[PDB]
Please model this.
Amino acid sequence: PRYYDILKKRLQLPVWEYKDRFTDILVRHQSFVLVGETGSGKTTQIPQWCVEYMRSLPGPKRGVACTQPRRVAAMSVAQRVADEMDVMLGQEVGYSIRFEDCSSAKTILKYMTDGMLLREAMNDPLLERYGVIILDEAHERTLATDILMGVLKEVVRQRSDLKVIVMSATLDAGKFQIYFDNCPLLTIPGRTHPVEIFYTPEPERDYLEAAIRTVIQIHMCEEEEGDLLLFLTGQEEIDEACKRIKREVDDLGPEVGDIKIIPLYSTLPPQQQQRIFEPPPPKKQNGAIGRKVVVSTNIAETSLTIDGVVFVIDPGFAKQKVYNPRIRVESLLVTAISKASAQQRAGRAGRTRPGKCFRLYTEKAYKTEMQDNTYPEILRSNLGSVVLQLKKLGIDDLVHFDFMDPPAPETLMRALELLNYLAALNDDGDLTELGSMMAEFPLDPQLAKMVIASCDYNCSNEVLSITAMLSVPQCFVRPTEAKKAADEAKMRFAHIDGDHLTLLNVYHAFKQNHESVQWCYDNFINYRSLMSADNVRQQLSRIMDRFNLPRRSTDFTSRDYYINIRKALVTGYFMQVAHLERTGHYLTVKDNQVVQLHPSTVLDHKPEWVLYNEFVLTTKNYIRTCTDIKPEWLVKIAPQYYDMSNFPQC
Amino acid sequence: YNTQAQSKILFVRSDASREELAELAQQVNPEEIQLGED
Amino acid sequence: MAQKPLRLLACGDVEGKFDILFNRVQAIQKKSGNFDLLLCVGNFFGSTQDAEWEEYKTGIKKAPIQTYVLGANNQETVKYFQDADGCELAENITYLGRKGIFTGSSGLQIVYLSGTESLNEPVPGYSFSPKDVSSLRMMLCTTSQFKGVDILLTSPWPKCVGNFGNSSGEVDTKKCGSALVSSLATGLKPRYHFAALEKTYYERLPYRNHIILQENAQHATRFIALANVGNPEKKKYLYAFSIVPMKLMDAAELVKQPPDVTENPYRKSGQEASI
Model:
């Protein structure tokens, strides 16, 4: 009966008027683009009809792949579409995401991360497991999706049986059409109700203050029943905003209606992410409208439909990943959104009934200053993990490979340089066996190299734990109200040689205290990161076991225990090293960037040479997760990089 | 005479949304009684 | 009991065409059932002595419905309206007066303002003064429980009424009309505002009566301008509509905004209020 009630709802989606037209294009054409606004039914209805196509084909049942850029999106829509097909999740409908695979030999529709299908492509280059592959929400132009577009453009020349469907929510289809050999376009019209677009008369000076004020005013003064969507840039900013919105409504007294604030970000567990599908609170007995406000990152910008939303609040910002290849820095920065994003944001209002979008900037600024399209992630990311995946795909010509928006050649030079000096490439540039193993790890190349090479330093059990703690959110919960108690608990685990060994101490103590939720609270340790780290470690070890990489430990009483770990770190991060200059600042190797130790380190002093996991570009340059290294290890472990003929004087 | 508490945010409606809404959304007044032709 | 909704007719410029108008009202009532009231908001009388009016004044012909009329819009017609506070002109046709409040037994509240704007002293019998506008506002808007009125009847269009709404055709709403009627409409907030005199039909998109996120939500206003009776271009001169009075309506239902609602046309921009 639940299936039939889902069926009644799904038949009203805009795509269903185009099912026959969809099927007509899909059978006759190899590639095509499908454009439809968010909520038209794309992610839920289109792969089910591909299952209908793939079930009627004769022979062995190949699956349907549908990519999702976002882990949170991929899991939740897989659950939803299992409910739409009246099957159990992980049976005929499953999901596969980075560090978590919920699939089986029955899986004929798998919603997956881009960076897992691309990794499956590294092991199945023609993607023979799938008869239809669906590139969904491709207007986000994520780093692994852009690679998958080119891989499928190769495979379609070799596999006339594979169908490729590129799904978008933006009018930038012309780029997607021309790139897939002038393939057809299926445009699904909106059935979004009208969205009124409001602008401020002048530009607001504090967009966070403006965001909080606009959220409260809508809740008190708007007579339409409806949920709120506040867009913000990330976790820490949402958490302070959620505290502020709480205080500023609590001071308004009992007459204001109840507001249901729900965070939605990627580091939340699945059970807490699933809470967004709960109904809004009811209207109070005094007539005050009960509303839900979802205060989300850009994970809610695509793939998701929150029913009942009427009022959208758009500050216009998000966090984007940026890479600066001239200085080899990767960072997350807050950037302005595109007009395309701002239209998609506004079109969330019109989903359940007519609605309003309150843009906190002038209408003049909207016309002339906002960018038309969002920049592709490949134009702003380190290609080192991608080039490692690309070389594993048999893509040798990285210069003339058909990227839809090609990266800067210098950025490609940095990806080749990084892999050459790591001995993942030789001096001719071919992919070594070491690189081929590194690509299979769902890690950055520095992290992948460090896990593999640590086997020879007899400390691969510890480095795998460090890498897992680095592949997950930072493990020290440091609440603003509780900093003193959190630091004093953190200093119980602080290792003198730095953060990597401090993460090791936290992880060992976590495993020694039998994964205790209470112990995590009492020591301000992120239980969810640690369970994710344990999940990360148990799967990377299964990759290590697959490549026979020996899990080794050094004697804990030996002086060389921590020293060997510190040497093993150098094997992957020798490019991410800084020297302590005589004036007490650090200078990064080759790129000569002036940096400081990040204020979350345990290092209270400055070693002459420090290795760092992450460069943190802010109002000052910081290096984060730092460890003391000795300079006589650099010339012995990496002579090609530390050749003093070409190395700058530092 | 013709010779002579945090500030609320003001919003003004967009021009573009007006043109799209006028054509598509002109709902016939539900209270209007349609008079016949002569 | 919950009362059945009322049914009303609104008529534009009659211009002395009494037989044409009332035969049409009779045909409609025979076809669609009885209407409660006919509101004539334009020129009721023509410029020349009307032989037709004499038959109605004497009782040979009778209006088929209770008819309320707005007053003498010009000097030529002032002679037909004997008492400035209102009087019965003929059977079933009642002049409401220069200004006042009509409250029906159903609870329907109608505010009316007759004439064109004038600043002259003494005030001509065919004109309204600033005093008329101020008096009406004080009678209603000074009560803490005031939400609005059901119907406002004026003969001229309000000045600047075309702002934010759909196209008004040949009438430039910024140059024509009365600024006092605009100010009066802003204060009284009618659910329906009927006007004429411009000899064309214009049904404007609804506008909201509150300022978004600055004030609590209020109901929307529908402005409808009606054409002249018997016009050659066949523009709509008779408007039929059915209304539940505001006093009987649920608060949440009354303030519901239609999807095509626009901003209030009479609100100045933030630079002009500085004076």
Notes: Chain B touches chain A at residues 6, 8-17, 20-21, 24-25 (CB under 8 Å). Strands of chain B lie at 12-13, 32-33. The helical segments of chain B are 16-25.
